[PDB]
Amino acid sequence: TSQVRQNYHQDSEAAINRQINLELYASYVYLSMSYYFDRDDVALKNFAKYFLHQSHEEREHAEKLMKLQNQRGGRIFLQDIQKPDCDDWESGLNAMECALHLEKNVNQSLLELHKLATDKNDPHLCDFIETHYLNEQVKAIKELGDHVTNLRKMGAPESGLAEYLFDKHTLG
Amino acid sequence: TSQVRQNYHQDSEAAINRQINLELYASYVYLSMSYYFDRDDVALKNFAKYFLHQSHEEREHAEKLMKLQNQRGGRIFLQDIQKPDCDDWESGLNAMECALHLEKNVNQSLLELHKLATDKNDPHLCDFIETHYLNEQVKAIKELGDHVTNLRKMGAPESGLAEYLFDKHTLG
Amino acid sequence: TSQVRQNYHQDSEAAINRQINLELYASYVYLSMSYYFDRDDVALKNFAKYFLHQSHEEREHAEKLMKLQNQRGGRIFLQDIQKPDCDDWESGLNAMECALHLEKNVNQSLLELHKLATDKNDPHLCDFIETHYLNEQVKAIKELGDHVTNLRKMGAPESGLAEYLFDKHTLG
Amino acid sequence: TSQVRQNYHQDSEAAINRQINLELYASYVYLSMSYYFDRDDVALKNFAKYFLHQSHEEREHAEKLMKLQNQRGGRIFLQDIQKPDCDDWESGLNAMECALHLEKNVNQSLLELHKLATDKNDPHLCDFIETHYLNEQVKAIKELGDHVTNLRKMGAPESGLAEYLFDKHTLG
Amino acid sequence: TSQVRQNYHQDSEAAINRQINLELYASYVYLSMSYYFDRDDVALKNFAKYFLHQSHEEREHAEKLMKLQNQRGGRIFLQDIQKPDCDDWESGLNAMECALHLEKNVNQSLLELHKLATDKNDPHLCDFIETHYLNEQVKAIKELGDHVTNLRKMGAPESGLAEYLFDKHTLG
Amino acid sequence: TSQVRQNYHQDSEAAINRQINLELYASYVYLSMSYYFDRDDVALKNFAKYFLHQSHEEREHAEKLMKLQNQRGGRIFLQDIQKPDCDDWESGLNAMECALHLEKNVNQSLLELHKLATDKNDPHLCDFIETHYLNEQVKAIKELGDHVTNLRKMGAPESGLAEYLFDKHTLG
Ligand SMILES: [Ca+2]
Ligand SMILES: [Ca+2]
Ligand SMILES: [Ca+2]
Ligand SMILES: [Ca+2]
Ligand SMILES: [Ca+2]
Ligand SMILES: [Ca+2]
Ligand SMILES: [Ca+2]
Ligand SMILES: [Ca+2]
């Protein structure tokens, strides 16, 4: 038991280890989406840059949780990072819809983590999650919803002109 | 026989002279495409600038090979430069498709040159081709493929609006 | 089959997909080592920074291969990223020894890839590997060997003073 | 028939197409002369630079005529570019004498073009030729005559010292 | 056996040790030529500076090979450095002719080293030689050929004025 | 006999030629020591840099003597440069002890040269040696003695920590 550990429940420690794997998995999903748009038969450079940036940010979120685990006297335990479910993402609109779904799932996991921290009376963990994760998730979800709405209204994905213009004017 | 000539096969010397003519020919093809887009009844200024730049680069590639011939103690032998097969290039998409085909043909010739240099055990010639030509060709081919994909997805060449927007947003 | 694909063997395409997973795995190993040194009961900040930097570079190497796959007309196929074999890395010296072993293994895979590219007569792939990977590997291996030699000569890992001073004077 | 065409005779259009080929041919001749001086057994670097610059300028002259053709509503028609008559240019003095002869021939063609434009009452074409070509030709011819006179007076080409010094002091 | 050694053949290691001695020997030859031109009865300062610079570069080439030996896990083994064959170099032209011969000999040794690396399947060693040595040798040889041609055409070495002017205008 | 030679004895000329070889030999010894510290199984970078700098300075000393020989109307006569007696230098302390011994030997040769110049009544040669060599030697010897004393007092070479710290704090 760590000399620094104080008011840090075993259940919280385990849940943090799970969240770490989830963020690394999200990073992997975004990495796959990015390079799909880099294909010569897809070729939407700004969609590709958008998802690569998202991939790097998810990786950063995971490292922040690893830092928190050590700060509290807990111990990091890593697991395999599962490959994404899809290899081909279909279209710009489909990719954005999948990302929205992914983000809502990560948000659900964070809300469950917050409830657990509350039940265990760990105010430091509650504030950490509120401060660094909760608001970021809400902003991310609103942004993806906006994008999905615009692509649909423009006539994507049936209209190839729609996806080309969105890549230039919104993501560019 | 040149006082500088060393490990430079007669077959390699001849193949270099052939590659020189091929690059000059590619330069001529791009020059023709450029001014086709400058016509009052076509009028796509950025397509015109794009192909003119390609024309100048091909000319530079040829001069580099002429420099290499002299460096190795070989002798330059020039041939007529054949006129392009087409005078009218039809459309932006058609021109891009023809350029893709042209580049793949020049790439094939370079791969054959590399194989010959390998058989003759000329490591300097192999590295020269690898360094200055092989990677440039691969990048060029990927770029043209990307362009072709976008124009097709936008609805070219049937859609005149598609070619107008690509000229502004991608080539501009 | 991609409109850009030329002289790119199916076996090469598959080997590239395998190398991509291997680099991502190496990235994961370095990430685990980094945060082990961040523990309150280990506490060697410069060892931690050193391995985190290595982790980011391996991730970059993987992305470069993903870029190459698309450039040649090949198709990315991702696999699970296996968790590292160890959770606890023992000591600074032990971690450096494990990294040396890891790098020699990645080097072996690259040498095998180069031999395959040679057999398939793919000069572009051979040069890509030579240029971006082979020399980097040799430098990395020499650096790790140097570090291991110094730690051993200083009296690590039995001497805790040795690891503390190396962290400050060499890695700092 | 172009919507922009006005007072542009069919004979003028054809003569412009011929002049375009002539300028491209002159460019090719200068390119050949340039690299002859780059040979290890000739080695006069400033003669080489001088002729390469002339080659680029002739190429520019041709592009200007291509621009003019399109401006007037005419249509570009390209022909093969014939290889130069010589592969070996003998000496610095001989090359300068050949260039003088070449320039006087191009000048004759331009004077004939001007006479035709005059007969067809095309004041715009007459002024274009006067402005951009006639004075440039006269200056070029005077310059080459000066060079030829100096080389001869110095004792070229029998004197190898003469050509070496001219390369340094006049062309350098 | 070095902890860093991987895919490095014993024959390659030995050949590298031999190349090291050869470059040091070339350095010694150029050093001797340099100070010959510094004599009061020769007095060509720019010839002297030219050869001294060549001497320093050869020394640098040798150190680079020593660095490579250590990087691969090989062991440096030095030999006596033989004195040059001549003490008196006769003339500027004679010195340049001897240097051309020397460089072609060093080039032959490098080509033989490359063939050996190829037979032993050492892609890293092949690329190292290609990258740092092969192209430098070709440039060096072309430069010396150019110099020899100019001196001969000027009337060296019978003409003392020729060597004086070349020292000022080419080497100065 | 040189038109510039004045009061320059044949014995002095010969002794200068011998000193030149001795300085080149010292340069070779330092070069060998330098790269010994660059080995993966030694790895003391600052010891390596220290000896490489010494190697370059000895080479400079030799060139200065070659310059002096020509200034006085004497003639340079070079000899083979013998390989160092050792290939493996054992340790940092051992290398420093060997260098101290080497420097005292070079100093003895210089003192003998000065005595000869004195006997031949050559005031210019005496002052040259005093000015450029004698004081430099004394400083070099004192510096090496200081280093040897410190390494011994620290517990080298039995203590690997001692050599590591000296490399950082004194030579770094
Ligand atoms: Ca598993
Ligand atoms: Ca013909
Ligand atoms: Ca290469
Ligand atoms: Ca799985
Ligand atoms: Ca024809
Ligand atoms: Ca011996
Ligand atoms: Ca001997
Ligand atoms: Ca004095």
Coordinates of N, CA and C in Angstrom, one line a residue, chain E:
Chain E
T1 N 31.7 -10.5 -28.0 CA 30.7 -10.0 -29.0 C 29.8 -8.9 -28.4
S2 N 29.8 -7.8 -29.1 CA 29.0 -6.6 -28.7 C 27.5 -6.8 -28.5
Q3 N 27.0 -6.3 -27.4 CA 25.5 -6.4 -27.1 C 24.7 -5.7 -28.2
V4 N 25.3 -4.8 -29.0 CA 24.6 -4.1 -30.1 C 24.7 -4.7 -31.4
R5 N 25.7 -5.6 -31.6 CA 25.9 -6.3 -32.9 C 24.7 -7.1 -33.5
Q6 N 24.3 -6.8 -34.7 CA 23.1 -7.4 -35.3 C 23.3 -7.4 -36.8
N7 N 23.3 -8.6 -37.5 CA 23.4 -8.7 -38.9 C 24.7 -8.0 -39.5
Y8 N 25.8 -8.1 -38.7 CA 27.0 -7.5 -39.1 C 28.1 -8.6 -39.3
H9 N 28.4 -8.9 -40.5 CA 29.3 -10.0 -40.8 C 30.8 -9.6 -40.5
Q10 N 31.5 -10.7 -40.1 CA 32.9 -10.5 -39.8 C 33.7 -10.0 -41.0
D11 N 33.3 -10.4 -42.2 CA 34.0 -9.9 -43.4 C 33.8 -8.4 -43.7
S12 N 32.6 -7.9 -43.4 CA 32.2 -6.5 -43.5 C 33.1 -5.7 -42.5
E13 N 33.1 -6.2 -41.3 CA 33.9 -5.5 -40.3 C 35.4 -5.3 -40.7
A14 N 35.9 -6.4 -41.3 CA 37.3 -6.3 -41.8 C 37.5 -5.3 -42.9
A15 N 36.6 -5.3 -43.9 CA 36.6 -4.5 -45.0 C 36.5 -3.0 -44.6
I16 N 35.7 -2.7 -43.6 CA 35.6 -1.3 -43.1 C 37.0 -0.9 -42.5
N17 N 37.6 -1.8 -41.7 CA 38.9 -1.4 -41.2 C 39.9 -1.1 -42.3
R18 N 39.9 -1.8 -43.4 CA 40.7 -1.6 -44.5 C 40.4 -0.2 -45.2
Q19 N 39.1 0.1 -45.3 CA 38.7 1.3 -46.0 C 39.2 2.5 -45.1
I20 N 39.2 2.4 -43.8 CA 39.6 3.4 -42.9 C 41.1 3.8 -43.2
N21 N 41.9 2.7 -43.3 CA 43.4 3.0 -43.6 C 43.5 3.7 -45.0
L22 N 42.7 3.2 -45.9 CA 42.8 3.8 -47.3 C 42.5 5.3 -47.3
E23 N 41.5 5.7 -46.5 CA 41.1 7.1 -46.5 C 42.2 8.0 -45.7
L24 N 42.8 7.4 -44.7 CA 43.8 8.1 -44.0 C 45.1 8.2 -44.9
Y25 N 45.3 7.2 -45.7 CA 46.4 7.3 -46.7 C 46.2 8.4 -47.7
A26 N 44.9 8.5 -48.2 CA 44.6 9.5 -49.2 C 44.8 10.9 -48.6
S27 N 44.4 11.0 -47.3 CA 44.6 12.3 -46.5 C 46.1 12.7 -46.5
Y28 N 47.0 11.7 -46.3 CA 48.4 11.9 -46.2 C 49.0 12.3 -47.6
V29 N 48.5 11.7 -48.7 CA 48.9 12.1 -50.0 C 48.5 13.5 -50.3
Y30 N 47.3 13.9 -50.0 CA 46.9 15.3 -50.3 C 47.7 16.3 -49.4
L31 N 48.1 15.9 -48.2 CA 48.9 16.8 -47.3 C 50.3 17.0 -47.9
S32 N 50.9 16.0 -48.5 CA 52.1 16.1 -49.1 C 52.1 17.0 -50.4
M33 N 51.0 16.9 -51.2 CA 50.8 17.7 -52.4 C 50.7 19.2 -52.0
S34 N 49.9 19.4 -51.0 CA 49.6 20.8 -50.5 C 50.9 21.5 -50.2
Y35 N 51.8 21.0 -49.4 CA 53.0 21.7 -49.0 C 54.1 21.7 -50.1
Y36 N 53.9 20.9 -51.1 CA 54.8 21.0 -52.3 C 54.5 22.3 -53.0
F37 N 53.3 22.7 -53.1 CA 52.9 24.0 -53.7 C 53.3 25.2 -52.9
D38 N 53.6 25.0 -51.6 CA 54.0 26.0 -50.7 C 55.5 26.3 -50.8
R39 N 56.2 25.5 -51.5 CA 57.7 25.7 -51.7 C 58.0 27.1 -52.4
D40 N 59.1 27.7 -52.0 CA 59.5 29.0 -52.6 C 59.8 28.8 -54.1
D41 N 60.1 27.6 -54.5 CA 60.5 27.4 -55.9 C 59.3 26.8 -56.7
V42 N 58.1 26.8 -56.1 CA 56.9 26.4 -56.8 C 55.9 27.5 -56.7
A43 N 55.5 27.9 -55.4 CA 54.7 29.0 -55.1 C 53.4 29.3 -55.8
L44 N 52.5 28.3 -55.7 CA 51.1 28.4 -56.2 C 50.2 28.2 -55.0
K45 N 49.9 29.4 -54.3 CA 49.1 29.4 -53.1 C 47.7 28.8 -53.2
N46 N 47.0 28.9 -54.3 CA 45.7 28.4 -54.4 C 45.7 26.9 -54.6
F47 N 46.7 26.4 -55.3 CA 46.9 24.9 -55.5 C 47.1 24.4 -54.1
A48 N 47.9 25.0 -53.3 CA 48.2 24.6 -52.0 C 47.0 24.5 -51.1
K49 N 46.1 25.6 -51.1 CA 44.9 25.6 -50.3 C 43.9 24.5 -50.8
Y50 N 43.9 24.3 -52.1 CA 42.9 23.3 -52.6 C 43.2 21.9 -52.1
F51 N 44.5 21.5 -52.2 CA 44.9 20.2 -51.7 C 44.8 20.0 -50.2
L52 N 45.0 21.1 -49.4 CA 44.9 21.1 -48.0 C 43.5 20.8 -47.6
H53 N 42.6 21.4 -48.2 CA 41.1 21.2 -48.0 C 40.8 19.8 -48.3
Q54 N 41.3 19.2 -49.4 CA 41.0 17.8 -49.7 C 41.6 16.9 -48.6
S55 N 42.7 17.3 -48.1 CA 43.3 16.5 -47.0 C 42.5 16.4 -45.8
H56 N 41.9 17.5 -45.4 CA 41.0 17.6 -44.2 C 39.7 16.8 -44.4
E57 N 39.2 16.8 -45.6 CA 38.0 16.1 -45.9 C 38.2 14.6 -45.9
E58 N 39.3 14.1 -46.4 CA 39.6 12.7 -46.4 C 39.7 12.2 -44.9
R59 N 40.3 13.1 -44.1 CA 40.4 12.7 -42.7 C 39.0 12.6 -42.0
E60 N 38.1 13.5 -42.5 CA 36.8 13.4 -42.0 C 36.1 12.2 -42.4
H61 N 36.3 11.8 -43.7 CA 35.7 10.5 -44.2 C 36.1 9.3 -43.4
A62 N 37.4 9.3 -42.9 CA 37.9 8.2 -42.1 C 37.2 8.2 -40.8
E63 N 37.1 9.3 -40.1 CA 36.5 9.4 -38.8 C 35.0 8.9 -38.9
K64 N 34.3 9.2 -40.0 CA 32.9 8.8 -40.2 C 32.8 7.2 -40.2
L65 N 33.8 6.6 -40.8 CA 33.9 5.1 -40.9 C 34.2 4.5 -39.5
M66 N 35.0 5.2 -38.8 CA 35.3 4.8 -37.4 C 34.1 4.9 -36.5
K67 N 33.3 5.9 -36.8 CA 32.0 6.0 -36.0 C 31.1 4.9 -36.4
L68 N 31.0 4.6 -37.7 CA 30.1 3.5 -38.2 C 30.5 2.2 -37.6
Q69 N 31.8 1.9 -37.5 CA 32.3 0.6 -37.0 C 31.8 0.4 -35.5
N70 N 31.9 1.4 -34.7 CA 31.5 1.4 -33.3 C 29.9 1.2 -33.2
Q71 N 29.2 1.9 -34.1 CA 27.7 1.9 -34.1 C 27.2 0.5 -34.3
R72 N 27.9 -0.2 -35.2 CA 27.5 -1.6 -35.5 C 28.0 -2.7 -34.6
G73 N 28.8 -2.4 -33.6 CA 29.3 -3.4 -32.7 C 30.6 -4.0 -33.2
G74 N 31.2 -3.4 -34.2 CA 32.5 -3.9 -34.7 C 33.7 -3.3 -33.9
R75 N 34.9 -3.7 -34.2 CA 36.0 -3.2 -33.5 C 37.1 -2.6 -34.4
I76 N 37.5 -1.4 -34.1 CA 38.5 -0.7 -34.9 C 39.9 -1.3 -34.8
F77 N 40.5 -1.5 -35.9 CA 41.9 -2.0 -35.9 C 42.7 -1.2 -36.9
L78 N 43.6 -0.4 -36.3 CA 44.4 0.5 -37.1 C 45.8 -0.1 -37.7
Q79 N 46.3 0.4 -38.8 CA 47.5 0.0 -39.4 C 48.4 1.2 -39.6
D80 N 49.7 0.9 -39.9 CA 50.6 2.0 -40.3 C 50.0 2.8 -41.4
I81 N 50.3 4.1 -41.5 CA 49.9 4.9 -42.7 C 51.1 5.0 -43.5
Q82 N 51.1 4.4 -44.7 CA 52.2 4.5 -45.6 C 52.5 5.9 -46.1
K83 N 53.8 6.2 -46.3 CA 54.2 7.5 -46.9 C 53.8 7.5 -48.4
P84 N 53.5 8.6 -48.9 CA 53.2 8.7 -50.3 C 54.3 8.3 -51.2
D85 N 54.1 7.9 -52.4 CA 55.1 7.4 -53.3 C 56.0 8.4 -53.8
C86 N 55.5 9.7 -53.9 CA 56.4 10.8 -54.4 C 56.6 11.8 -53.3
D87 N 57.7 12.5 -53.4 CA 58.1 13.6 -52.5 C 58.0 14.9 -53.3
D88 N 58.2 14.8 -54.6 CA 58.2 16.0 -55.5 C 57.1 15.7 -56.5
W89 N 56.1 16.6 -56.6 CA 55.0 16.4 -57.5 C 55.1 17.0 -58.9
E90 N 56.2 17.5 -59.3 CA 56.5 18.0 -60.6 C 55.8 19.3 -61.1
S91 N 54.4 19.3 -61.1 CA 53.7 20.5 -61.6 C 52.2 20.4 -61.2
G92 N 51.5 21.5 -61.4 CA 50.1 21.6 -61.1 C 49.3 20.5 -61.8
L93 N 49.6 20.4 -63.1 CA 48.9 19.4 -63.9 C 49.2 18.0 -63.5
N94 N 50.5 17.7 -63.2 CA 50.8 16.4 -62.7 C 50.1 16.0 -61.4
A95 N 50.1 17.0 -60.5 CA 49.4 16.7 -59.2 C 47.9 16.4 -59.4
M96 N 47.3 17.2 -60.3 CA 45.8 16.9 -60.6 C 45.6 15.6 -61.2
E97 N 46.5 15.1 -62.0 CA 46.4 13.8 -62.7 C 46.6 12.7 -61.7
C98 N 47.5 12.9 -60.8 CA 47.7 11.9 -59.7 C 46.5 11.8 -58.8
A99 N 45.9 13.0 -58.5 CA 44.7 13.0 -57.6 C 43.5 12.3 -58.3
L100 N 43.4 12.4 -59.6 CA 42.3 11.8 -60.3 C 42.5 10.3 -60.2
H101 N 43.7 9.8 -60.4 CA 44.1 8.4 -60.3 C 43.8 7.9 -58.9
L102 N 44.2 8.7 -57.9 CA 43.9 8.3 -56.5 C 42.4 8.1 -56.2
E103 N 41.6 9.1 -56.6 CA 40.2 9.1 -56.4 C 39.5 7.9 -57.1
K104 N 40.0 7.5 -58.3 CA 39.4 6.4 -59.0 C 39.7 5.1 -58.3
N105 N 40.8 5.0 -57.6 CA 41.2 3.9 -56.9 C 40.4 3.7 -55.6
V106 N 40.2 4.8 -54.9 CA 39.4 4.8 -53.7 C 37.9 4.4 -54.1
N107 N 37.5 4.9 -55.2 CA 36.1 4.6 -55.7 C 36.0 3.1 -55.9
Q108 N 37.0 2.5 -56.5 CA 37.0 1.0 -56.8 C 36.8 0.2 -55.5
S109 N 37.6 0.7 -54.5 CA 37.5 0.0 -53.2 C 36.1 0.1 -52.6
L110 N 35.5 1.2 -52.8 CA 34.1 1.5 -52.2 C 33.1 0.6 -53.0
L111 N 33.3 0.5 -54.3 CA 32.4 -0.4 -55.1 C 32.5 -1.8 -54.7
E112 N 33.7 -2.3 -54.3 CA 33.9 -3.6 -53.9 C 33.3 -3.9 -52.5
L113 N 33.4 -2.8 -51.7 CA 32.8 -2.9 -50.3 C 31.3 -3.0 -50.5
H114 N 30.7 -2.3 -51.4 CA 29.2 -2.3 -51.6 C 28.8 -3.7 -52.1
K115 N 29.6 -4.3 -52.9 CA 29.2 -5.6 -53.5 C 29.3 -6.6 -52.4
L116 N 30.2 -6.5 -51.5 CA 30.3 -7.4 -50.3 C 29.1 -7.3 -49.4
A117 N 28.8 -6.0 -49.1 CA 27.6 -5.8 -48.2 C 26.4 -6.4 -48.8
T118 N 26.3 -6.3 -50.1 CA 25.1 -6.8 -50.9 C 25.1 -8.4 -50.7
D119 N 26.2 -9.0 -50.9 CA 26.3 -10.5 -50.8 C 26.0 -11.0 -49.4
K120 N 26.3 -10.1 -48.4 CA 26.1 -10.5 -47.0 C 24.7 -10.0 -46.6
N121 N 23.9 -9.5 -47.5 CA 22.6 -9.0 -47.2 C 22.6 -8.0 -46.0
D122 N 23.4 -6.9 -46.1 CA 23.4 -5.9 -45.0 C 22.9 -4.6 -45.7
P123 N 21.6 -4.4 -45.6 CA 21.0 -3.2 -46.3 C 21.5 -1.9 -45.6
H124 N 21.7 -1.9 -44.3 CA 22.1 -0.7 -43.6 C 23.5 -0.3 -44.1
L125 N 24.4 -1.2 -44.2 CA 25.8 -0.9 -44.7 C 25.7 -0.4 -46.2
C126 N 24.9 -1.0 -47.0 CA 24.8 -0.6 -48.4 C 24.3 0.8 -48.5
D127 N 23.3 1.2 -47.8 CA 22.8 2.5 -47.8 C 23.7 3.6 -47.3
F128 N 24.5 3.2 -46.3 CA 25.5 4.1 -45.7 C 26.5 4.5 -46.7
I129 N 27.0 3.5 -47.4 CA 28.0 3.7 -48.5 C 27.4 4.5 -49.6
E130 N 26.2 4.2 -50.1 CA 25.6 4.9 -51.1 C 25.4 6.4 -50.8
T131 N 24.8 6.6 -49.6 CA 24.5 7.9 -49.1 C 25.7 8.8 -48.9
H132 N 26.7 8.4 -48.1 CA 27.8 9.2 -47.8 C 29.1 9.2 -48.6
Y133 N 29.2 8.1 -49.4 CA 30.4 8.0 -50.2 C 30.3 7.9 -51.7
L134 N 29.5 7.1 -52.3 CA 29.3 6.9 -53.7 C 29.1 8.2 -54.5
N135 N 28.1 9.1 -54.1 CA 27.9 10.3 -54.8 C 29.0 11.3 -54.7
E136 N 29.6 11.3 -53.5 CA 30.7 12.3 -53.3 C 31.9 11.9 -54.2
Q137 N 32.2 10.6 -54.3 CA 33.2 10.2 -55.2 C 33.0 10.6 -56.7
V138 N 31.8 10.4 -57.2 CA 31.5 10.7 -58.5 C 31.7 12.2 -58.8
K139 N 31.3 13.1 -57.8 CA 31.4 14.5 -58.0 C 32.9 14.9 -58.0
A140 N 33.7 14.3 -57.1 CA 35.1 14.6 -57.0 C 35.8 14.2 -58.2
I141 N 35.5 13.1 -58.8 CA 36.1 12.6 -60.0 C 35.8 13.5 -61.2
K142 N 34.6 14.0 -61.3 CA 34.2 14.8 -62.4 C 34.9 16.2 -62.3
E143 N 35.0 16.7 -61.1 CA 35.7 18.0 -60.8 C 37.2 17.9 -61.2
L144 N 37.9 16.9 -60.8 CA 39.3 16.7 -61.2 C 39.5 16.5 -62.7
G145 N 38.6 15.8 -63.3 CA 38.6 15.7 -64.8 C 38.5 17.1 -65.5
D146 N 37.6 17.9 -65.0 CA 37.4 19.2 -65.5 C 38.7 20.0 -65.4
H147 N 39.3 20.0 -64.2 CA 40.5 20.7 -64.0 C 41.6 20.3 -64.9
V148 N 41.8 19.0 -65.1 CA 42.8 18.4 -65.9 C 42.6 18.9 -67.4
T149 N 41.4 18.9 -67.8 CA 41.1 19.3 -69.2 C 41.5 20.7 -69.4
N150 N 41.1 21.6 -68.5 CA 41.4 23.0 -68.6 C 42.9 23.3 -68.6
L151 N 43.7 22.7 -67.7 CA 45.1 22.9 -67.7 C 45.8 22.5 -69.0
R152 N 45.4 21.3 -69.5 CA 45.9 20.8 -70.7 C 45.6 21.8 -71.9
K153 N 44.4 22.2 -72.0 CA 44.0 23.1 -73.1 C 44.7 24.4 -73.0
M154 N 45.0 24.9 -71.8 CA 45.7 26.2 -71.6 C 47.2 26.1 -72.0
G155 N 47.7 24.9 -72.1 CA 49.1 24.7 -72.4 C 50.0 24.2 -71.3
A156 N 49.4 23.8 -70.2 CA 50.3 23.3 -69.1 C 50.8 21.9 -69.5
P157 N 51.9 21.5 -68.9 CA 52.6 22.3 -67.9 C 53.8 23.1 -68.5
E158 N 54.0 22.9 -69.8 CA 55.1 23.6 -70.5 C 54.9 25.2 -70.3
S159 N 53.7 25.6 -70.3 CA 53.4 27.1 -70.1 C 53.3 27.4 -68.6
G160 N 54.2 28.2 -68.1 CA 54.2 28.6 -66.7 C 53.1 29.6 -66.4
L161 N 52.7 30.3 -67.5 CA 51.7 31.3 -67.4 C 50.3 30.6 -67.2
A162 N 50.2 29.5 -67.9 CA 48.9 28.7 -67.8 C 48.6 28.3 -66.3
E163 N 49.6 27.7 -65.7 CA 49.4 27.3 -64.3 C 49.2 28.5 -63.4
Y164 N 49.8 29.6 -63.6 CA 49.7 30.8 -62.8 C 48.2 31.4 -62.9
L165 N 47.7 31.4 -64.1 CA 46.4 31.9 -64.4 C 45.3 31.0 -63.8
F166 N 45.5 29.7 -63.9 CA 44.5 28.7 -63.4 C 44.4 28.8 -61.9
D167 N 45.5 29.0 -61.3 CA 45.6 29.2 -59.8 C 44.8 30.4 -59.4
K168 N 44.9 31.5 -60.1 CA 44.1 32.7 -59.8 C 42.6 32.6 -60.2
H169 N 42.3 32.2 -61.4 CA 41.0 32.3 -61.9 C 40.1 31.1 -61.6
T170 N 40.6 29.9 -61.5 CA 39.8 28.8 -61.2 C 39.9 28.4 -59.7
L171 N 41.1 28.3 -59.2 CA 41.2 27.9 -57.8 C 41.1 29.0 -56.8
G172 N 41.2 30.3 -57.3 CA 41.2 31.4 -56.4 C 39.7 31.9 -56.3

